[PDB]
Paper text:
Hydrolysis of c-di-GMP by EAL domains has been shown to require the presence of divalent ions, either Mg2+ or Mn2+, with the most efficient reactions occurring at alkaline pH2933. Here we report as yet structurally uncharacterised EAL domains from the core genome of Pseudomonas aeruginosa, PA1727 (MucR) and PA3825.
We propose this as a potential third metal binding site, designated as M3. Diffraction data collected above the manganese absorption edge confirmed the presence of Mn2+ in the M1 position in the pGpG/Mn2+ PA3825EAL complex but showed no signal for manganese at the M3 metal like centre. Consistent with the absence of any anomalous signal in the M3 site, we have placed and refined sodium in this location which is abundant in the crystallisation condition and consistent with the geometry observed. The M3 metal site displays a tetrahedral coordination sphere consisting of Asp 160, a water molecule, the ribose O2′ oxygen and a P1 hydroxyl oxygen from pGpG. In PA3825EAL, the M2 site is empty, but Glu217 (contributed by the β7-α7 loop in close vicinity to the β5-α5 loop) replaces interactions with the phosphate moiety normally made by M2. While PA3825EAL lacks a metal in the M2 site and possesses one in the M3 site, the comparison with CC3396EAL, in which all three metal sites are occupied, suggests M3 site is a bona fide metal binding site in PA3825EAL. Instead, the M3 metal is observed in the product state where it is ideally poised to stabilise the negatively charged transition state during hydrolysis of c-di-GMP to pGpG; where pGpG directly contributes to formation of the M3 metal site via its non-bridging phosphate oxygen (terminal phosphate group of pGpG). The data presented also allows the identification of a third metal site M3 which is a hallmark of the product state.
Author numbering: 5 to 258
């Protein structure tokens, strides 16, 4: 076989699909947004998670077309159900580094925003802190244009990589996402308490929103809310779900 060929074939057959993981307010309430996560519905193997295929997709140069197809599918999925979403509903996408050197991301974003009434949603792009994006005049231009569209920038897996304050102002960062490994250590390791608290400290100093990822227990939720964490995500809040389950739950919240 050829795994590159097989990714191309999967893309042509629309086998990459969105799952939706909800975000809720630190102090509780109805969902204020979703993170969109790629799944591969494989004809044989079933539903495959992205750690099994995204790195190959990056090596092969296919991640950008796969991301575009996801964003288009989200527009067709949630575009006609805006009234189920309270205003300011966040929709987040993980963006690969190569996509951030490409001015076509601006068009991908404008197209997704065009599928909802104006200002109804807030589109969030998540860039992992692990690979820190090298700046150029192209990235300066791209991020100015995204900002002017109303797109927000979140730095994902925060606390695991090595970014600086100066880099946070460069790319106009709106939000830090606390890596789930730090959240897993709450009520256990003392070191990570100081790390977590230092992430919270930085977000206050810079006036940034903060999402904790990986909130699995009530003890985690309560520790994080006592520290002002804006938004919570994790299995306690809701596992990544297909559209049908997302719509179900949004109808209940009303
Ligand atoms: N580039 C990229 N990464 C994704 C996408 N969906 C999920 N990931 C990443 O894959 C990893 C595993 O996610 P889960 O198995 O849903 C996470 O770090 C997540 O951010 C996507 O559409 N694009
Ligand atoms: N074990 C575990 N994984 C989670 C939890 N919440 C989200 N995930 C997974 O973490 C990944 C999201 O990571 P990113 O922050 O890198 O997008 C997805 O694969 C998602 O399914 C959680 O509470 N526990
Ligand atoms: Mn993410
Ligand atoms: Na990520």
């Amino acid at each position: 076989a050829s795994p590159s060929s097989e990714l191309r074939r999967a893309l042509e057959a629309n086998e990459f699909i969105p799952y939706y993981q909800p975000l809720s307010p630190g102090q509780g309430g109805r969902w204020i947004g979703v993170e969109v996560l790629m799944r591969w519905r494989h004809p044989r193997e079933g539903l495959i998670r992205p750690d099994l295929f995204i790195p190959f997709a990056e090596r092969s140069g296919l991640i950008v077309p796969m991301t575009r197809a996801l964003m288009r599918q989200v527009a067709e999925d949630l575009g006609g159900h805006a009234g189920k979403l309270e205003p300011g509903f966040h929709i987040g996408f993980n963006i690969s580094a190569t996509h951030c050197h490409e001015l076509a991301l601006v068009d991908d974003c404008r197209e997704l925003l065009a599928a909802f009434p104006p200002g109804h949603i807030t589109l969030v792009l998540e860039l992992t802190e692990r690979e820190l994006i090298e700046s150029s005049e192209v990235t300066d231009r791209l991020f100015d244009e995204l900002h002017a569209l109303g797109v927000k920038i979140a730095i994902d897996d925060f606390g695991t990589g090595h970014s600086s304050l100066a880099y946070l102002r460069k790319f106009q960062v709106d939000c830090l996402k606390i890596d789930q490994s730090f959240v897993a250590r709450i009520g256990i390791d003392t070191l990570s308490g100081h790390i977590l608290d230092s992430i919270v400290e930085l977000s206050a100093k810079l006036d940034l929103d903060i999402v904790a990822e990986g909130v699995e227990t009530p003890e985690q939720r309560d520790y994080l809310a006592a520290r002002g964490v804006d938004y919570l995500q994790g299995y306690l809040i809701g596992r990544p779900m297909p559209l049908e389950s997302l719509l179900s739950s949004l109808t209940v919240q009303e």
